[PDB]
Paper text:
To establish the structural basis for FrmB and GloB substrate specificity and enable future structure-guided prodrug therapeutic design, we solved the three-dimensional structures of both S. aureus FrmB and GloB. FrmB and GloB have distinct ester substrate specificities, which are supported by the structures of their active sites.
Conversely, FrmB orthologs hydrolyze p-nitrophenyl esters of short-chain fatty acids (C2–C6) and are thought to mediate detoxification of cellular formaldehyde. A single dimer of FrmB is observable in the asymmetric unit, matching the apparent molecular weight of FrmB as observed via size-exclusion chromatography. The overall fold of FrmB is characteristic of the α/β-hydrolase fold. Six parallel β-strands and one anti-parallel β-strand pair form a central eight stranded β-sheet, which is surrounded by α-helices. One monomer of FrmB has electron density for a single magnesium ion, whereas the second monomer has two magnesium ions present. However, SaFrmB and human esterase D differ notably in the solvent-accessible surface around the active site, suggesting the potential for distinct substrate utilization, primarily driven by differential positioning of the cap domain. The active site pocket extends and opens significantly after passing by the oxyanion hole, supporting the capacity of FrmB to hydrolyze substrates that contain large steric groups distant from the carbonyl carbon, such as 11O.
Numbering used by the authors:
A (entry chain B): -2 to 251
B (entry chain A): -8 to 164, 176 to 251
The structure:
Amino acid sequence: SHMAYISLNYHSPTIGMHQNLTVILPEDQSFFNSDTTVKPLKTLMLLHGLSSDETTYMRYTSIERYANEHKLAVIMPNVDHSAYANMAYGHSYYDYILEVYDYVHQIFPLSKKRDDNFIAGHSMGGYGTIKFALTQGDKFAKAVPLSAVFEAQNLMDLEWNDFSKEAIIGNLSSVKGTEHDPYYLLDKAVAEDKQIPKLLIMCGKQDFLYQDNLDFIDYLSRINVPYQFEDGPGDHDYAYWDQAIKRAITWMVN
Amino acid sequence: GLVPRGSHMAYISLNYHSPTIGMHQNLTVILPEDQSFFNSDTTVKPLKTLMLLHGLSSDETTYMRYTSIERYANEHKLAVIMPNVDHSAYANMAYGHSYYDYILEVYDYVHQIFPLSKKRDDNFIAGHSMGGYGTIKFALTQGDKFAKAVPLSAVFEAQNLMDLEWNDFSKEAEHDPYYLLDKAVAEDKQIPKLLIMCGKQDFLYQDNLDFIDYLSRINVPYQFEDGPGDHDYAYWDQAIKRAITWMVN
Ligand SMILES: [Mg+2]
Ligand SMILES: [Mg+2]
Ligand SMILES: [Mg+2]
C-alpha cells in the first residue's frame, strides 16, 4: 500500500482567487497500466476549522497513514475565513467546497458514486459537514461531524479574523431559522424527504462544544434521524481529532 | 458551478512511489484549468501534454524557478510534466537499466490519473543537456508516442554522469544517439518532428552542428535554431518559450 501526496495551487472561479488543496491518492495498479481503465477510488472530503489550513491535518495527525491502510483518497481544501460570511451568494463556502468536489472528481480517478463518497470535519468544518449532509445528501453516503458547531451562538466563540468576525457579528441576527442554521436545515431535509447520509458524530467530553453536541443529538433522536455518537476524554484539539479521524476512517470504509 | 474565465494553471507537486525503481520520486505538473474540469455535467477535454526532462544539475523544481515556463504554458494551454531525473536518481536508473522504464512509467501514470490526451499528435517531449540526450533517445525509440521532440543544448554521451564525487567502486561501475538514429532510419521507424536548439557560445554547439549535419546526410527532417546563448537557464528560458509556441502550432 502506497500513497501519492499531492499539493495543488489553482485559481478558484468561485472565490475568485488562488486556493491550495492537499490530495492524498492511493496508488492502484490500474494507474500504471495504460491498457486498463482506472479503478475509481473511495473519497473523503475533509474540512478543517478556523485555526488550520490545507496542511494542518497532515502535520498534526497521522491521517495519511490511516488513509493508506484503508485505500481512501482524501481531499483537504484550504478554507479562508472570508468564505463563510464575507462573500456574495454563489461565491461562498458552500459553493467553494462543491467546486473543489467537482474539480477533483473531474481531474483525478475518484469515484463519483454516492456510496464511495464521504465528508467529515471539525469545529467550523463540522458545521460544514452537517450543512453538506443536509443539503447534498444525494452526494455523500456518510458524514462525520467532529466537535462540530451546531448553533448560532457558538459562532461568536470562535477564532475569526477581524473582517470575518465583523460579518459574523453583523449577520448573527439573521442566522436562526435560515439555511445557515443546522437545525433549520435538519427540519427542511426531513420535510423534503431528502436522503440524509449515515451520521457518525464525535466530540470529546472536555470540549467547550460538548453540551451543544449533546443537545443536537438529542434533537436528532426526537425527530427520528439515525446516527451514531461516540464520545470519550478529549478536548478541542488535534490530539483528539487524530484519534477521532482514525476511528472515522475505519467506520467510513467498512 | 462556476468555471474559469480566461487562462489559469494549476501548479501541482506530486510525490509517489515508483514501481519501476522501488523508490519515492517527485514530479511537478502544471495543468491548465480547462472549463470542462469544473463542470460536472460534461466530459473532460484531454489536454496537449509536454514531457520535459531537466539536466543533471537540476531537479523537478528548477524549470519552475529559473524560467517562466509556466507563463508560456498558460498562454498556450499546455500541460507540462517535469519528473525528477536528478543526478543520484539518474545514476540508479542508468545502473539498473531502468531509465526508459521510469520515464515511460511517469508518462503512463500521469495520463492515467490526469486529463491528458493520449493521442500522439497531442504529446511532445523536450529537455536540455542530459535531458536533451534523453529527448533524442525517446524520439528515436518511442517515436510512435510523441509527435514532436525538442532537444535543447543536448549532450551526445552520458559522461556528465561521472561529474559527482563517486567512490572508486561507483566510478568503476544502443545508448548512442547515432546508433539509435541509424537503427530508426534503417528500420523505417516513426521519428517525431524535430526542433533542435543550441546557443552559439555553448561548449556543445559543435556537437549539435555535427548531429544536424548527420541528420541532413541521413535524410531525417528537422529544424535547427541557434543564436547567442550558453549552457544555462538564461538560454533555456528563451528556448523553451520558443519551443512551446512551436509545439502547439
Ligand atoms: Mg482548527
Ligand atoms: Mg473552528
Ligand atoms: Mg546534464
